[PDB]
Amino acid sequence: SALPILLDCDPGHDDAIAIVLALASPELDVKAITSSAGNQTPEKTLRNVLRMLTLLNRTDIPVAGGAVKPLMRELGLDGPALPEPTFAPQNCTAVELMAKTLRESAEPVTIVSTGPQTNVALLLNSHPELHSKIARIVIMGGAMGLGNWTPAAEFNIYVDPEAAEIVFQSGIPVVMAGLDVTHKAQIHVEDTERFRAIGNPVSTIVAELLDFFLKWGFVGAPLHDPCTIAWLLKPELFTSVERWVGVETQGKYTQGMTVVDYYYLTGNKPNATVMVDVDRQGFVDLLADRLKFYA
Amino acid sequence: GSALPILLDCDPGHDDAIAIVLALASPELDVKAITSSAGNQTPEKTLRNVLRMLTLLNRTDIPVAGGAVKPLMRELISGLDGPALPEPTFAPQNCTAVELMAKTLRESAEPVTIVSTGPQTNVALLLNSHPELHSKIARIVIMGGAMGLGNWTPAAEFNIYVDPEAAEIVFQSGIPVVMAGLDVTHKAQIHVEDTERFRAIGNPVSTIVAELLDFFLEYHKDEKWGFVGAPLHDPCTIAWLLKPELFTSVERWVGVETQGKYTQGMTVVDYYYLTGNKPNATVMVDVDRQGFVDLLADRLKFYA
Amino acid sequence: ALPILLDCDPGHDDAIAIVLALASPELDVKAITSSAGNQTPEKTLRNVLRMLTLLNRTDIPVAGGAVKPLMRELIIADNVHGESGLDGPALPEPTFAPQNCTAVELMAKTLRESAEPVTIVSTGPQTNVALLLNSHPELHSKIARIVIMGGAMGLGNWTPAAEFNIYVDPEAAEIVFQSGIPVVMAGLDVTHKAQIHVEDTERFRAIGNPVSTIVAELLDFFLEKWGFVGAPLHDPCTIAWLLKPELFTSVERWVGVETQGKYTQGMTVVDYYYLTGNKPNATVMVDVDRQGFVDLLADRLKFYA
Amino acid sequence: ALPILLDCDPGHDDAIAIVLALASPELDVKAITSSAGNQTPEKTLRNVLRMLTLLNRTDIPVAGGAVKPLMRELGLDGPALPEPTFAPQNCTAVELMAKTLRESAEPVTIVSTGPQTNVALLLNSHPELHSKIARIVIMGGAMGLGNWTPAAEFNIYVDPEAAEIVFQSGIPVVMAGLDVTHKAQIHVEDTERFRAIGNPVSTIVAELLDFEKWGFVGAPLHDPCTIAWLLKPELFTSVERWVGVETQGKYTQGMTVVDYYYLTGNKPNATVMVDVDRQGFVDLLADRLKFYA
Ligand SMILES: [Ca+2]
Ligand SMILES: [Ca+2]
Ligand SMILES: [Ca+2]
Ligand SMILES: [Ca+2]
C-alpha cells in the first residue's frame, strides 16, 4: 500500500534531510537510493548516501553510484559528526539498480531526483520499455524566475541541461520543485531550534546540518530538496500549475534555464506540474512531526 | 529653451501614440525628431501613424523620417484603431531614420537622449554605423524586455523578440541604457476610472487618448494576465524622463539572448549579481501608479 | 582474435559489413546490437537477426538498442535503403531470438566479462554507444577504441554540412568523440572513394556461393549529382580498416560534432590544419586503395564456399 | 564602364585588387571604403589612401567605415609605399556608398573583399537603394575547409552576422571563397614575370607576393579574384547555389554552408566560384600591370 519510490540525489545537506523525511514516512517505500554528482564528486555523493543510511538504520535499502559527470559537460555534509558507512553499495550502476527496481516492481514507481538529472535521463533513454513502470518524476531543480547559479538558471539544471531536457521531453509526468517554491520553504532560526528541541540523534543532526548552512534577503535558509518528498506526503501544502516547461541547452546567456510557459504563449502541451507556493509553517510542522519517528 | 533634447523612435501603436502626446505636452522636453520603427505594424503604417499624430497635435514642425523595413537579421512580425485621426498634412523628410538621427546628433551642441519604444532596429543601425557620434548620445531609454515572464514567448517581450540582435547591440554599446520592461509597464495600468478621468478633461486630444485606451481594452483585455486595467507601456519612458521619482529602478547587467532554442529575445537581468558583468542598464522595477495617472491627466491639460 | 562489439542499423552496407566480419577469423564478433537510423528499431533488429540466420551464426548474441536519438526524433534513411532495410535479395526469416535485454546491457555484459579490451564498431547513429559510455564509466578501460562509420570532413550527404549517421544523433556522436576513448572515423572522405563498380559487383556474383550472391544482389539494389563511377560502400570500411589498415591513409586530428548550429547540426568539424588548441581525439580515414578494398571483400567472400 | 564600389581592408591582396581595378578601363571605381579585419580601421583607411596616392588616383573618393563587427569584437609591409597626399571624405563608408548609389544613373556593383560589416550596414539602413545595387561580389567563405577555424574563412568569421545579412538580402551575391582563391596561386616564376614588367607598380606588386601545411605550390591571391571575375568571368567556373552563414554554432561560427547537392528547400542566393584557369588569371594580371608603363 505504501508508494514505491526511487530516490536519486547528491547529498548535500538538503538531500540528506530529504532522505530523513522519506524514511520517517511509512506512506513511502523507498526502493533504492542512487547518487548523482553535482553538489560534490560522485565518490562523495555515494559516500554521503551510505553515511545517511547508516545513521538512519536502513542499510537494507539498496544503494548504487551513478554517472560520474553530466551527459555532455564537465562536472558535502559538513557540520554534524556522521557515522562511517557500515555497508556497501550494490555492485552495479545507478541506472542498473533503477532498471532492476522497475522491472521487478508490480506497480509503477515514483522517481524523485534532487541532484542533476543525469542518471534519470540515462534510464529514460536506455530503457524505453520501462517507461510504463514510471508513475512520475518529481524533481528539485529549475526556476520560473531568476536562477541561483547564473542569472537565468538554477544549479541542478545548469550542471546538466541536456539530461533535464531529456526528462521534461520524455512523455513521463514531471513534477518540479524549482526555486519559486523552494525559496519560500525557508527554515527560520526558531524552526531550527524547534527541530533541535525534539531530542533525538537524528533531529539533532538535522538541526546541526541546518546550523552549518547559516543578496537574496531570505529571512531564514531555503530547504530545497525536502519539498519533493513533502509534496508526495502532503500535496495540499503546495500550490502548483500544470504548464509546459522547456530546458535551454543552446543559449549564449541562458543555458540551463527552465522556460515555463506560464501564460500559454506557446503551442506546447503541458508536460509538468510546477510548484509555485507552499504553506511554509505547514512544511516546518511536517518536518518537525516526522522527526518524532526517530524517538 | 534649455529643455532636454530628445530623439523619439517608435512604432505607433496606441501606446507609442500616447507617449508622443505626453512628450509634446512637456516643455521640459525638446523633441528633435520622431522616426518610425516596424514591429507593431508594417513600416508604411508606423510612419503614417507618426505623421497623423503630429498632424493631430499641431507639431508638423518636428522632422519625421521612416526607418528600417525589417529586423537586422530576421523577418518582420491602421495600428491606431478606435478614434478618428486626421490624415497627414505634411511629409516626412527625404531621408532614413538613421540619417535624421545622425543629422540631429551632429548638429546638436549637447548630448541627445534617445527614446526608442519599438524594436531597437534603427537605434542599433545608428550605433553601428556612427561610432563617432556615441559621444552625442546621453543615454537610450527603451520600452522593452522583461526581467520576469515575457508577453510574446514565455521568456521574451515583443519589442526585443522582434529584433534581439538590435537590442543586444544597444545593450552592449557602452551607452547608458534605461529599460522600461514588463516588470514596470505591467504595473502602470490604466483602470476604467482613469480612462474616464482622461475623457472628462474635455479637449480633442484627451478624447483621442481616452478612445485609444477604449479600443485597446475592448479588443485586447488580457484574460490570462489578470490585469485590473490595461498596461500603458510606452509612456513610461517619457514619464521616467519627466518624473523619475515616480519610479524605482536598479542598476544591473542586462544581456539579450540571440541564440537560445527556447529563449530568443529574453532580457537576462543579473539581479543578484551572479555574473562577472559590469552593469550596463537602469532597469525600472516599480512605479507609483496613481502618480503616473496624475502625470498623464495634468499633461493632457496642455491641449486645452 | 580481436574481440569486437558490432553496433549497426542494417541497411545494406551494415549487412555487407557483418558478412565481412564473420568471414574474418582475425575477428571475434562478441555481439551485434542494433541502432535505429537507416530504419525503425524493429526493422534494424530484425535485419541483424536475418543476416546471422543467413550466415549460420545464431550463436552470436543480439540485442535491440535505443528506439530514438538521445534528444531528437528519429528520422530514417527510408527510400535510399527501401522498405525492409535490406531490399533486393531473398533473405531467411530469423530462426533465433535476440537476448532478453537492451543493446547497452549486452555491451556492458560483454565488456565486464572480457579479459582484454574490446573494440566497438558502430556503423549507425552513435546513440547506443553514447549511452554505454555515459552509463558505464567504470568500463571505459575495457574499450580499446571505437571505430565508426559517420561524418565528413568535406560536404555531407544528408544536409550540406552533415552526414546522416551523425546528423540523426549529433549529441551521441559528440559524446563518443569527447569520451577520451580513441576514435577511428570512416567518414564520407574515405567511403566515397570506396566505390564498387559494376565490374566489381559482377566479380562478387561470380564467386558462386549463396552469400556472395546476396552481397551482389544487395549492391544491385544500391543502383547522379555526386558523379560516382559506382556505388560507395560505407560500413565495410570500418571492418576493412581493422583487417588491413595498410589499405587506408589516415590522419590523427581533433574532431568536434556540431550540436547547436542553425545550418550545421551534425557536422563533424575536423581540425585538419591544426588551427584550434585542441588535442587530437580521432584517427580520420582520408583515402583507400579501392582495388585492394575490393580484393579484400572478394577474398573473404570465399569463406562461404 | 561598369560603375563599382570597392570596400576592402588592405591587406596586400586587397591592395593588388585595387591595382588591377584601376588598370581596367572596363571598370569605373566610384569610391573605395575601408573595412576592418586584416588590421585596425585606422590602418586599413591609411592603406587605401597610400594605394591611391601610389596609383595617381587621388580623384577617387575614400571613406573609413565601421570600426568593429556588428556584434563582435575585432597591413601592407614589404615595399616602400608613398605617404597619403590626400584626405578621406568627411563621412563614413556607408554614407559614401549610399551617396554613390543615390546619384548613380544605373545600378552599381559592390566588391567587398574584407569583412561584410559596411555592406550589411548599407543594406539594412538603405532598403530604398537595393534597386541601385546590381550585385555584391565578395572574397570570403569556403565550401570546404576554413583558413581561420576548421569550418570558417577569416573574412566571414570576423563578422558572420554581416555576411549572413548580405547573403539573405535578396541582392545577387558572387562568392570568391577559398575553393577558387586557393587555386589562384602565384608561383615564384609568376612573381618574377610581374617584376620583369619594369614599372614602379609591377615592382610593388612583386615585392608583396615575394613575401605551409596547406602544401601550396605558390601563394594564393585571394582578393584580385573578385576583380578578375568582373573582367573575365570566362576564366572561372561557378555554380548557382544556396549559401547560409552559420552565426550560432558551437564549432562552426562563420562557416559558409553551401548547398552544393541541393539537399535543402532553399532558393539559390549566390554564384559560387569553384575553379579558375590559373595561367589565364596570371596573364590578366601581367597584362593589366602594363597600364602603369
Ligand atoms: Ca541536491
Ligand atoms: Ca511601441
Ligand atoms: Ca549503417
Ligand atoms: Ca581583404
Residue numbers in the entry:
A (entry chain B): 1 to 75, 86 to 224, 231 to 311
B (entry chain D): 0 to 76, 85 to 311
C (entry chain A): 2 to 224, 230 to 311
D (entry chain C): 2 to 75, 86 to 222, 230 to 311
Question: What's the publication's text?
Answer:
Pyrimidine-preferring nucleoside hydrolases (CU-NHs) are members of the broad family of Ca2+-dependent hydrolases that catalyze the cleavage of the N-glycosidic bond in nucleosides. Two CU-NH-encoding genes are present in E. coli cells, termed either ybeK and yeiK, or rihA and rihB, respectively. The structure of each monomer maintains the α/β fold that is typical of NHs, with the Ca2+-containing active site located in a deep, narrow cavity at the C-terminal end of a core 10-stranded β-sheet surrounded by α-helices.
The molecular replacement method unambiguously identified four independent molecules in the asymmetric unit, arranged as a tetramer with the subunits related by 222 symmetry. In the closed structure, the highly conserved His82 residue of the αL loop is interacting via a hydrogen bond between its Nδ side chain atom and the corresponding atom of His13, in a side-by-side orientation.
